[PDB]
Each structure stands twice: as structure tokens, then as C-alpha cells.
Amino acid sequence: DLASLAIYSFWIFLAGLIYYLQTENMREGYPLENEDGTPAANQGPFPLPKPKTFILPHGRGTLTVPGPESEDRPIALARTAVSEGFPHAPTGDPMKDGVGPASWVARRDLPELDGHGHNKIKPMKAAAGFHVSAGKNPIGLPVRGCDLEIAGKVVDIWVDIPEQMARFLEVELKDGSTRLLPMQMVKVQSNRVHVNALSSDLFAGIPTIKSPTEVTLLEEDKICGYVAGGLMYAAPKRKSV
Amino acid sequence: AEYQNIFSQVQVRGPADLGMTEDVNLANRSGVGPFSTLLGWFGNAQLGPIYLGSLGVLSLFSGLMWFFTIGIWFWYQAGWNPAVFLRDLFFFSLEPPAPEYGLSFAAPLKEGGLWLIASFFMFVAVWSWWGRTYLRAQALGMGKHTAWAFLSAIWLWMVLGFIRPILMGSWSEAVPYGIFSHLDWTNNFSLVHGNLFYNPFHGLSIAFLYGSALLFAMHGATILAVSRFGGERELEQIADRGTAAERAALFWRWTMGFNATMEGIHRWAIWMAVLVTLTGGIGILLSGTVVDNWYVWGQNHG
Amino acid sequence: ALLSFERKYRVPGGTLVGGNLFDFWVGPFYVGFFGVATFFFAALGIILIAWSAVLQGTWNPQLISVYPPALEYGLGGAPLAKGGLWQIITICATGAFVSWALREVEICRKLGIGYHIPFAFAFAILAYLTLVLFRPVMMGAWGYAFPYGIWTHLDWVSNTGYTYGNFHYNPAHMIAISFFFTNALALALHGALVLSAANPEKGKEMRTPDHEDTFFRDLVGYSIGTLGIHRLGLLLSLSAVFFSALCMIITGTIWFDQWVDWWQWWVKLPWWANIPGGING
Ligand code: BCL
Ligand code: BCL
Ligand code: BCL
Ligand SMILES: CC[C@H]1c2cc3[nH]c4c(c3C)C(=O)[C@H](C(=O)OC)c4c3nc(cc4[nH]c(cc(n2)[C@@H]1C)c(C(C)=O)c4C)[C@@H](C)[C@@H]3CCC(=O)OC/C=C(\C)CCC[C@H](C)CCC[C@H](C)CCCC(C)C
Ligand SMILES: CC[C@H]1c2cc3[nH]c4c(c3C)C(=O)[C@H](C(=O)OC)c4c3nc(cc4[nH]c(cc(n2)[C@@H]1C)c(C(C)=O)c4C)[C@@H](C)[C@@H]3CCC(=O)OC/C=C(\C)CCC[C@H](C)CCC[C@H](C)CCCC(C)C
Ligand SMILES: CCCCCCCCCCCCCCCC(=O)OC[C@H](COP(=O)(O)OC[C@H](O)CO)OC(=O)CCCCCCC[C@H](Br)[C@@H](Br)CCCCCCCC
Ligand SMILES: CCCCCCCCCCCC[N+](C)(C)[O-]
Ligand SMILES: CCCCCCCCCCCC[N+](C)(C)[O-]
Ligand SMILES: [Cl-]
């Protein structure tokens, strides 16, 4: 029967496809590791795929995956149990050490470039022809932390040029230096910008950027990590509201 | 509330983005259209430009002729009365030739011929539009995944309208052009083939259709959940894994014990979707050509 | 075992209930108080299904079926073998799903991510509860719920549909279907687009989100953007399930006749109601 042949073949195909898909999804993070970072004994029934290479634009190299996995940064955490499967306690301040929900990855310390090789994200002040087109303009709004105290003031929006969208608010602190806040972690209100994740005392500790008119992928990760970390780690200072 | 990132809080606008050039013939791109502040709360505000070369003009024109062929038939069914046209719009139907005409073109216009003309125009609109999905990719140096994916949808459509009717010996087996009439056709097709719930390919197709909803809910929710770390910038997360891609994987690993990568979730995605109409097309193609009754088939084949 | 990059995220905290008591993993799986709850509800559910198998007299998974209380029982309880188990397994199911959503909320809290996933999932649970709880309660009996069996639930779908004629004519159901098909359209296009950029023609550099915008603008005159498309997929898929729940919640309750006949309100609007010709005059 031709339907029987069709349905039986399709199941063979779907099994092969699921196998292939799972292996493709093991191009990052594998081989699996023990808690000490050595290779685990049981890797599973799926093997690592054969490596592929992405040719990155703008002379930025390739990426070949799978390859040798490494954190490329120290992890300030320690075991809390004598066997596998329990949490690992921060050994210092998890927000400064960048662990837990404050974690960051050691992405390239260069900015993301657009199709034409230009920095993807720029302060709006430096982005020819960019302006706020609808919504409350946050520039000039005081910025409030979850301790209900003012941490600073908004001095610019950092915009994604090719996608025409707000990505960070640039916030000036008491000492006149600035920090970037992810736009996804702020609430623009009629008379302020509210930041639930951080109390005002934590703003100074936001990782700074080394050049004031561009951010690197590495710097984005440190800022975004640190801000998200505050939901857990600034909870004591987080007033009800 | 935390901001949830479903709508944007502030819109920014800059100079109209005219796009990458690569090998595209710029003579064929319109100027930019207007900007919609309304679309802008949710996606991009910018409309246009559009590329329209000769294959695009063919597809559009042919598409419009399909649409006018049905339209003119409806207006005729309505006795040229716009009151009646609006009233009975969902009830009108352009029906294929009777069984007696087989696969011939001999049928009167009012009783098959217009359906054949309409189907002709649709055939040209879709296939040229397919070519346009390949060529627009080619001109930008991108892969052809879209044109391959589109071919799976074309398959189900080709099966319902052309391949299955040809294999059965008559245009009368194809689907009428009409809102209600095509639903009636669908119901009737199942009744007459012993209940399509007994077709294993139909069950598969449902699994994938539902699964597409599961998967895009999972994936959209996920990217939005990690948008605070730049997660929607998927190409760069592919090229240089960030804490967005890592938190996204680990959410799923901790929930269900396995996970994806940023590139690879898009392979789960293309396949989950494409298998809807691939399996669906097989199921329909086999119906009445090889299997007259799926309940019966079922009883003899597990 | 851990993913290469996983250790830094396995910190204490984020639990909703029980502090550190259940703040641990088994292999890849996070436990938490809601892991223990899910397991308890699942396990009891599966055991009870297995016992129903015994009382039906089969183990075959294409035959095992747990049916709800017959309509005579109304909204009361029934004996184990005659509807009671279904009622208990439904409670266990609801408990396991809601426990799974709350476990997901615990995983979000530990990872510092948004709650969009469990929120999304809560729509699926609502669809389920529409079919087994809200709709039965509004209709006055547990018997209107679907039975738990691979094929028998398909029987219930078909029977339930044909009670109202061709169910296609349910207008909320048309909107639901539209969202399902559109969602599958969008999923295909999205996967294909990111992959076409990540995997360009042979020998060439990866493309940019700018190439992705350009491709769609060249093709259809509009690009929704990388943020937009993920918002869109979430909206389409949730809207699909919202309208599904809606189309059933109204059926047997506010509307219970043949769905085809609902459409007469439009045809009988008084301006065109009596004009001869067309299909309906
Ligand atoms: C949604 C509207 C109707 C309905 C209409 C249909 C129709 C019509 C069809 C199905 C089909 C299926 N339905 Mg149903 N189905 C309903 C409610 C449910 C519920 C539920 C708890 O609410 C569940 C668990 C299922 C489960 C299933 C699967 C057996 C099968 C494939 C679905 C799929 O891949 O989805 C997408 C999800 C994924 C791809 C993820 C994987 C999900 C897996 C496959 C679920 C396994 C379920 C397991 C066998 C149930 C027992 C659990 C154990 C006790 C632990 N249905 C309601 C009543 N369903 C198809 C079939 O082939 O039936 C025989 C089919 O044609
Ligand atoms: C009483 C009715 C029968 C029945 C009869 C049928 C029939 C008959 C068919 C299906 C098919 C399907 N049914 Mg069934 N079905 C029933 C009950 C169900 C139930 C349920 C909960 O009860 C569900 C969930 C489904 C679900 C499904 C899908 C999985 C599948 C269609 C997939 C798809 O994407 O198609 C939609 C996608 C397309 C049609 C592709 C179209 C692509 C073309 C190229 C687009 C042209 C566009 C045109 C130019 C206009 C453009 C305008 C633009 C804006 C410019 N059925 C009952 C049992 N079903 C189909 C299938 O595959 O079955 C195996 C099919 O033929
Ligand atoms: C003869 C049949 C009638 C008909 C009668 C009905 C009836 C009756 C119903 C539908 C419903 C639907 N129909 Mg209809 N329908 C018909 C024709 C069609 C066609 C078609 C192409 O002809 C299509 C595309 C559809 C489409 C649809 C969808 C809009 C909707 C189903 C999805 C849903 O509710 O998901 C919602 C998703 C869920 C319920 C899944 C819940 C999952 C839970 C929360 C998780 C389970 C976990 C599991 C146990 C895990 C197991 C273990 C793990 C896998 C390890 N119908 C014909 C005309 N249709 C249904 C609906 O709207 O229901 C609300 C419905 O009840
Ligand atoms: C893989 C399975 C799914 C799938 C995939 C899929 N579909 C696709 C693709 C893919 C991968 C494409 O690449 C292609 C596409 O271009 O998407 C943008 C397409 C496509 N899928 C389409 C539709 C479609 N897909 C569907 C389904 C599905 N598509 C599946 C669920 C369905 C249904 C019934 O469920 C429909 C209706 C089209 C949007 C597009 C194919 C376009 C096409 O072939 O067009 C030819 C016809 C014309 C060109 C006539 C156009 C006339 C214009 C509307 C004139 C406008 C002028 C002016 C604006 C008038 C003013 C009035 C207006 C306000 C109305
Ligand atoms: C709202 C949009 C869509 C959606 C979204 C969605 N689903 C989700 C999520 C999201 C966002 C999750 O986060 C969650 C997940 O973890 O996915 C991997 C989930 C999930 N969606 C699932 C399934 C699923 N979703 C579906 C649908 C959808 N899910 C929608 C279309 C469907 C169908 C039929 O269309 C199914 C079958 C699971 C993979 C997963 C939830 C897993 C879970 O809750 O696990 C805990 C429970 C158990 C391990 C077993 C419980 C056992 C019971 C106690 C007994 C069985 C009773 C049951 C009622 C019998 C059914 C018999 C059938 C034959 C009818
Ligand atoms: C997918 C199926 C349908 C797809 C939708 C197709 C819609 C067709 C849109 C109709 C476009 C009409 C174009 C007229 C253009 C014209 O007359 O001249 C352009 C004229 C001047 O251009 P120029 O002088 O620069 O000419 C070219 C030059 O020589 C080289 O640079 O400028 C214009 O008119 C711009 C008009 C704006 C075009 C934007 C169209 C937006 C389309 Br409708 C978007 Br909103 C459609 C969205 C549909 C999405 C559907 C996907 C479904 C999932
Ligand atoms: C579509 C059904 C769901 C697909 C299930 C795929 C199984 C995933 C295999 C997990 C292996 C995990 N591991 C050991 C590699 O970490
Ligand atoms: C026979 C093959 C054709 C596939 C079926 C197409 C039916 C779709 C319904 C279109 C309805 C006509 N109109 C103008 C109101 O759209
Ligand atoms: Cl507007």
C-alpha cells in the first residue's frame, strides 16, 4: 500500500530530522561539563556535529562551532554542598563579580556594526537626523531607583540606527559621569524614569564604557547583566510599590 | 509593572532607510512610502521601498486578474446590484466544471471556464511570486531558505487545485473560489473520504500546526524575556554568544532538560512550520487517489 | 552535568516557596517547590489513569480512555469507575500545569529574565480549563468535557463540532484558524529569514539584520523588524488560543443552534433583506 509506504517513510525521515536538529543545537555549550569544568562522563546519545564556520563581515574574522568552550573570565562562586546539583554561593559581591542573574559573557570588546560597517548603536546626539518621533521624550527626566531615591537624570537616548529604535538611556550621576541603562529595564513616566531593578546607591557600580560615543558587545553584556542582577540582589532596598 | 516590551515606550525616527544594495538593481526599487506612528508602537514605522521588476509586475498583474475574474463572477451572481453584492458576498462562489468535462477546457464560461481562467491567473501569480522570493534573496547574497519554505506551502496548494484534480481525472475535484463554498468543500472532502481524522498525515499536520503555535509562543516569549540583554539581535548572538543566548538556553534546560542555540532554534522553527503543509499535502494527495476511506484504511494498517 | 557556560547562573535564590529547601537541580532540571508539586500531581495523575486502564480492561495506549461523568451526574461527583477518576485526574492535571507555570516563574527569577514564557503558557492552560472546567460548568455538567484518550478525544471533537452543524461557521473559530495559519506563515518566514542571513550563499560573509529588512522590503514593501517579529509570533500564537477558548466558551452557552444560521443576522439587515436576486433572494 502506497499510503503505508508514505507514512512509514515519513516517520523515518522525522526521526532523522530530529536527530539532525538536536545535533545542530549542540554547537554551543557542549561537551557537557562537571561542576568543576572538566568533561562530564555522560554526554548523551547525540554526538557533536561536524564544525561549521561563519565568515563574519567587516574583517572581523570567523566563528567555528563547535569548538573549545571556555568562560574566558573568573567565576566568583563556590560549592555549598558535597555533591552535584546544588547552588553555588557567590564568594564576594555577586553584582560586582558578575555571577548569578548579574552574569555577563565575555563577548568581543568591539561594537556591533551595521550593514555598512558603522556602529549600530550611537547616542542620539551623534546620530544625524535621529529624533524622538512619538511617546514621552525621556531626555531630561530624573531617574528614580527602587529605593524611591533619585539616582540621576537622563541625558540622551542611545539608538539603534539601522532598526530605528531606543536601546539605552544615558543617565548622568551625581559626579557628572554617565551610565547606560537598558531601555527594557526602565519605565518612562510623565515626570520621571523609574528603574525597579536598582536602588539609587547601585547606579555608580553600573559598568562604564571606555569611549563615550560607542559601546562594545562586552560592555553591553556587563551593563545588561548588572542591571538585571538587581532584581534579585537589590531586593532588600526594594520598597513596596 | 515591569515594562514588558510588547509595545515601545518611545519611538525614534531617522532618515529613511533605503536598504542594502549588494547586487540589487536599484532602478526597480520605489522610493520610501510614509511612516506610520501606529505600526511604530509595535514594529517598524517605515513603509517601503518595494522592489518591483518585471517578474513582480507579472505576478501583481496576474494576481489582480485572478481577483477580478472572481469579482466579476460575484457581481454577476449579485445581479449587478451592490446592495445584494455586500449582502451575499460570503455566499457567492466560482465553481469548477462539472465531472462530465473531465480535464478538458470545453466547459462554458458560466459553468467552468471562468474557474479555469481564474485558476490560470492564480497559477501564474503564485509561481512568479515564488521566483521573486528566490531572486530577491539572490540579489542580496542571502540563502534561499525562504523560497524553499514557500515551496512547502505551494505544495499543499498545488495538490488541492492542480495535482490531485489531474490524478483524479477532473477539474470538478478542485476547490471553488468562495468564502463559505470552500469551507463546505473542506467539510465534504472529509465526509466523503471517511473522516480525515483517520488520515495519519492529517494528524501529523495538526501536530505541526499546533506545534508552530507552541514553538512561536515559546520562542517569541523567550526573545522578549531576554530582550533586556539584547536577545533579539539574533545574528550577532549567533556570531558571538551573549548572556541573552545563555539565559534563554538555560531557561529551557532547567525547565525541560534540553535546549537550543540561537541559530538552531531557527531550524526547529523553519521545520515545525514547513511540515504543516508538507505532511498536509501528502495526506490530501493520497485521498481518493490511493485511499478512498481513511477509517477503512486505518482498520487494515494499524 | 552542565553546559560549558552554565555554572555562573546556578546561584541560590528566586524560589517562591520554601526558601533553600528545594533550591537544587536533578541533572539539567531545576526542582524547586513547584518541581516537587508538579511531580506529585503528575505522578498521582498517571497512577490514576493507569488504574482507569485496569477498570476499562486494557493497557493499550491507543485504547486507554478516561471519560467524564455522564450528563446525568450534572456538576456533582461520580464513582471512580464511572466518571470519578476523570474528575480527580482533571484536578491533578490542572495542578501539574499550574505548578509547571509557577516553576517556570521560579526559573525566571533565578535567571533574571522576564516572565513572558509562563505568561504565554498560562494561555494554553486557560484553553484547557475552558474545555474541561469553564464550559462544562456554564453548560451544567462534567460530561461536556472531553475524555482523555488518544482517539476518543478526537471523537469528542468531531461530535461536539457536528452538534452545531459545520463548525466552520463559528465566527470566533474562523478568527482562531486565521491566527493559527498566519502564525505558521510567520514562523516559516522568521526561521527562513534568520537562517538565510546566518547562512548566505557559499563563500560569502554572514548578512546583517539590515539585509533582512531589505529582503522583506524588496519582497512585500514592509519589514516589521527583529523586535517586531518576536512580538508578532507571540501575539499571533496567543491570539490563536484566545479565540479558540472564546469560540468554545460561547458554544453551548450563548449560542447552541446550527452555526451556519448565525450568519442570517447579516443577510436580514432590513435595507438589503428584501432585495431580489443574489444567492439569498
Ligand atoms: C486542542 C483541541 C482539542 C484537540 C484536538 C486534536 C486534534 C484534531 C488532533 C489532536 C492531536 C493530538 N492531541 Mg489533542 N486536542 C485537545 C487537547 C489535547 C491535550 C490537552 C491536555 O488539552 C493534549 C495533551 C493533547 C494531545 C494530543 C496529541 C495526542 C496529538 C498531537 C498534538 C500535538 O502535537 O500538539 C502540539 C504539541 C507538540 C508538538 C508537543 C508534544 C506534545 C505531545 C505529542 C503530547 C503527548 C500527549 C500524551 C500522549 C498524553 C498523555 C500524557 C501522559 C499521561 C504523561 N490534546 C483538545 C480537546 N488533538 C492529533 C492526533 O494525531 O491525535 C491522535 C490530531 O489530529
Ligand atoms: C470537517 C472538516 C475536516 C477537515 C478537513 C480538512 C481538509 C479537507 C484539509 C485540512 C487541512 C488541515 N486541517 Mg483539517 N479538517 C477537520 C478538522 C481539523 C481540526 C480540528 C481541531 O478539528 C484541525 C486543527 C484541523 C487542522 C488542519 C491543518 C493542520 C491542515 C491545513 C494546514 C494549513 O496551514 O493550511 C493552510 C495553508 C494553505 C492552504 C497553503 C496555501 C498557500 C498558497 C500558495 C497561498 C495563496 C495566497 C493567495 C495568492 C491569496 C493572497 C492574498 C495576500 C494577502 C496577497 N482540521 C475536519 C475533520 N482539513 C488541509 C490538509 O493539509 O489536510 C491534510 C486540507 O486540505
Ligand atoms: C468536525 C470538527 C469541526 C471542528 C470542531 C472543533 C471543536 C469541537 C474544537 C475545535 C477547536 C479548534 N479548531 Mg475546529 N473544527 C473543524 C475544523 C477545523 C479546521 C479545519 C482546517 O477544518 C481547523 C484549522 C480548526 C482549528 C481549530 C483551532 C482553532 C482550535 C484548536 C486548537 C486549540 O484549541 O488549542 C488550544 C490548546 C490546548 C487545549 C492545549 C493545552 C495543552 C495543556 C495546557 C498542556 C498539556 C501537557 C501534556 C499533558 C504534556 C504531556 C507530557 C509531555 C509531552 C512530556 N478546526 C471541524 C469543522 N474545533 C477547539 C478549541 O477551540 O478549543 C478551545 C475545540 O474545542
Ligand atoms: C509553510 C506553511 C505556511 C506558509 C508559508 C509561506 N507562505 C508564503 C511564504 C512562506 C514561506 C512566502 O515566502 C510567501 C511570502 O511572500 O510571504 C511574505 C508566502 C505567501 N503566503 C501567502 C498567503 C497565504 N499563506 C498561507 C498559508 C501558509 N503559508 C502556511 C500556513 C495562507 C493560508 C490560506 O493559510 C495564505 C492565504 C501570501 C501572503 C504569500 C504569497 C503571495 C503570492 O503568491 O501572491 C500572488 C498574488 C498576488 C501577487 C496578488 C496581490 C494583489 C495585491 C493585494 C494588490 C495590492 C494593491 C493595493 C495595496 C490595493 C488596495 C486595497 C487593499 C487594502 C486590499
Ligand atoms: C498558548 C499558545 C500555545 C502553547 C504555548 C505554550 N505551551 C507550553 C509553554 C508555552 C508558552 C510552556 O512554557 C510549556 C513547556 O514547557 O513547553 C516545552 C508548554 C507546554 N505545552 C505542552 C503541550 C501542548 N501545548 C499545546 C498548545 C499550546 N501551547 C498553544 C498552541 C498542546 C496542544 C494539544 O496543542 C499541547 C499538547 C507541554 C509540552 C508543555 C507543558 C508540560 C507540562 O505541563 O508538564 C507538566 C505535566 C506533566 C509532565 C504530565 C501531566 C500528566 C497529567 C497529570 C495527566 C494527563 C492528563 C491529560 C489532560 C490527558 C490528555 C490526553 C490526550 C490524549 C488528550
Ligand atoms: C505578499 C502578497 C502581496 C504583497 C504586497 C504587495 C503590495 C504592492 C504595493 C504597491 C506598490 C506600488 C508601487 C508604486 C511605485 C511608484 O509608482 O513609483 C515609486 C514612487 C517613486 O519612486 P521612484 O521615483 O524612486 O521609482 C523608482 C526609481 O526609478 C528607482 O529608485 O514612490 C512611491 O510611490 C512609494 C510608494 C510606497 C510603496 C510602499 C508599499 C508598502 C506595501 Br503596501 C506594504 Br505596506 C505591504 C505590506 C504587506 C505585508 C504582507 C505579508 C503577509 C504575511
Ligand atoms: C519534537 C519532540 C521534542 C524533541 C525531543 C528531542 C530530544 C532532546 C535530546 C536531549 C539531549 C540533551 N543532552 C543530553 C544532549 O543534553
Ligand atoms: C481549486 C484551488 C484553489 C484553492 C482554494 C482557494 C479558495 C479561497 C477562497 C477565496 C475567496 C474569493 N474571494 C475573492 C472572496 O477571496
Ligand atoms: Cl499612523
Swiss-Prot record, chain A:
- What S-S linkages are listed for this chain? none
Q: Which domain of life is it from?
A: Bacteria
What is the recorded membrane topology of this protein?
Single-pass membrane protein
Q: Name one GO biological process term.
A: photosynthesis, light reaction
One Pfam family of this protein, by short name?
Answer: PRCH
The note on cofactor binding and number reads: Binds 4 bacteriochlorophylls per trimer.
The molecular function terms of the Gene Ontology recorded here are: bacteriochlorophyll binding; electron transporter, transferring electrons within the cyclic electron transport pathway of photosynthesis activity
Q: Which residues cross the membrane?
A: 2-21
Localisation per UniProt entry: Cellular chromatophore membrane
- Keywords for this entry? Bacteriochlorophyll, Chlorophyll, Chromophore, Electron transport, Membrane, Photosynthesis, Reaction center, Transmembrane, Transmembrane helix, Transport
Question: Cellular component GO terms, alphabetically?
Answer: plasma membrane light-harvesting complex; plasma membrane-derived chromatophore membrane
Q: Which cofactor does it need?
A: a bacteriochlorophyll; a bacteriopheophytin; Fe cation; Mg(2+)
Cytoplasmic compartment residues: 22-241
Which parts form a coiled-coil structure per UniProt?
A: none
What is the role of this chain? The reaction center is a membrane-bound complex that mediates the initial photochemical event in the electron transfer process of photosynthesis.
Describe the protein's quaternary organization and the partners it interacts with.
Answer: Heterotrimer composed of subunits L, M, and H.
Would you identify the family this protein belongs to, as annotated? Belongs to the reaction center PuhA family.
Q: Which NCBIfam families does its entry note?
A: puhA
Protein name, per record? Reaction center protein H chain
Lineage, top ranks:
Bacteria, Pseudomonadati, Pseudomonadota, Alphaproteobacteria, Rhodobacterales
From Swiss-Prot, chain B:
| One protein family per Pfam | Photo_RC
Subcellular localization, as worded in the UniProt entry: Cellular chromatophore membrane
Where is this chain primarily localised?
Answer: membrane
Q: Which residues cross the membrane?
A: 53-79, 110-139, 142-167, 197-225, 259-285
Q: Residues of the signal sequence? A: none
Q: Name one GO cellular component term.
A: plasma membrane-derived chromatophore membrane
Query: What residues bind a ubiquinone, as annotated?
Result: W252
Task: Supply the InterPro entries for this chain.
Answer: Photo_II_D1/D2_sf, Photo_RC_L/M, Photo_RC_L/M_CS, Photo_RC_M
Q: Which amino acids does the record list as binding Fe cation? A: H219, E234, H266
Q: Which residues bind (7R,8Z)-bacteriochlorophyll b?
A: H182, H202
Tell me where on the tree of life, at the top rank, the source sits.
Bacteria
Q: How does it sit in the membrane?
A: Multi-pass membrane protein
Describe the family membership recorded for this protein in Swiss-Prot or TrEMBL.
Belongs to the reaction center PufL/M/PsbA/D family.
* Assembly: Reaction center is composed of four bacteriochlorophylls, two bacteriopheophytins, two ubiquinones, one iron, and three highly hydrophobic polypeptide chains (designated L, M, and H).
What job does the chain carry out?
Answer: The reaction center is a membrane-bound complex that mediates the initial photochemical event in the electron transfer process of photosynthesis.
State the name under which the record lists this protein. Answer: Reaction center protein M chain
Name the species this protein comes from.
Cereibacter sphaeroides
The encoding gene is pufM
Swiss-Prot record, chain C:
Q: What is annotated about its quaternary structure and interactions?
A: Reaction center is composed of four bacteriochlorophylls, two bacteriopheophytins, two ubiquinones, one iron, and three highly hydrophobic polypeptide chains (designated L, M, and H).
Q: Which organism is it from?
A: Cereibacter sphaeroides (Rhodobacter sphaeroides)
Q: State the superkingdom.
A: Bacteria
Q: Hydrolase: present as a keyword of the record?
A: no
Q: Where does a ubiquinone bind?
A: F216
Q: Does the keyword Transcription regulation apply?
A: no
Subcellular localization, per the record? Cellular chromatophore membrane
InterPro entries for this protein: Photo_II_D1/D2_sf, Photo_RC_L, Photo_RC_L/M, Photo_RC_L/M_CS
Q: Which residues bind (7R,8Z)-bacteriochlorophyll b?
A: H153, H173
Segments on the Cytoplasmic side according to the record's topology features? 1-31, 112-115, 199-224
Annotated binding of Fe cation, by residue: H190, H230
Keywords (alphabetical) are: Bacteriochlorophyll, Chlorophyll, Chromophore, Electron transport, Iron, Magnesium, Membrane, Metal-binding, Photosynthesis, Reaction center, Transmembrane, Transmembrane helix, Transport
Mind telling me what this protein is named? Reaction center protein L chain
Where is it mainly found?
membrane
Q: What does this protein do?
A: The reaction center is a membrane-bound complex that mediates the initial photochemical event in the electron transfer process of photosynthesis.
Question: What Pfam families does this protein's entry cite?
Answer: Photo_RC (PF00124)
- Topological region Periplasmic: 56-82, 139-170, 251-281
Give the intrachain disulfide bonds: none
TM region positions: 32-55, 83-111, 116-138, 171-198, 225-250
> GO annotations under biological process?
photosynthetic electron transport in photosystem II
Q: Under the cellular component aspect of Gene Ontology, which terms does the record hold?
A: plasma membrane light-harvesting complex; plasma membrane-derived chromatophore membrane
Q: Which GO terms describe its molecular function?
A: bacteriochlorophyll binding; electron transporter, transferring electrons within the cyclic electron transport pathway of photosynthesis activity; metal ion binding
How does this protein lie in the membrane? Multi-pass membrane protein
The region annotated as signal peptide is none
Query: Which family, according to the similarity comment?
Result: Belongs to the reaction center PufL/M/PsbA/D family.
